[PDB]
């Protein structure tokens, strides 16, 4: 039998978007040294070891 109505459901529109960027970054070749960070509140006294990994 011919169907005059079928369950097409809701009309929903979907939108896809794309965002592109290109960046050029300069990094410094830092020495690996040990710095003292004093205790502060809940932060305990600790040693810090530095790097050049940006």
């Amino acid at each position: 039998a011919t169907a005059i109505l079928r369950p097409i459901g809701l009309h929903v529109e979907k939108f896809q978007q794309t965002y592109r960027k290109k960046w050029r970054f300069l990094t410094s070749a830092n020495a690996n040294v040990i710095l003292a960070e004093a205790a502060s509140g809940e932060r305990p006294a600790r040693w810090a070891l530095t790097t050049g990994m940006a």
């Binding site: 690996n32 040294v33 040990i34 710095l35 040693w47």
Partner: protein, 54 residues
């Protein structure tokens, strides 16, 4: 230099462990070739110079 000080050392920051950082270490012990000094030797002297170590 390879493994660093204990965390409670006063000198902790002076040697960041190369086992952690992978940084370069200077070596200071070098091969040395000896021969006798006969300037003050009495009697029969051995005057053979050096071995040709090259």
């Amino acid at each position: 230099a390879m493994y660093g000080y204990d965390n409670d050392s006063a000198d902790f920051a002076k040697k960041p462990p190369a086992d952690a950082t992978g940084a370069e270490i200077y070596l200071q012990d070098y091969l040395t070739i000896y021969t006798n000094d006969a300037r003050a030797t009495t009697g029969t002297k051995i005057l053979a110079g050096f071995p040709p170590y090259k």
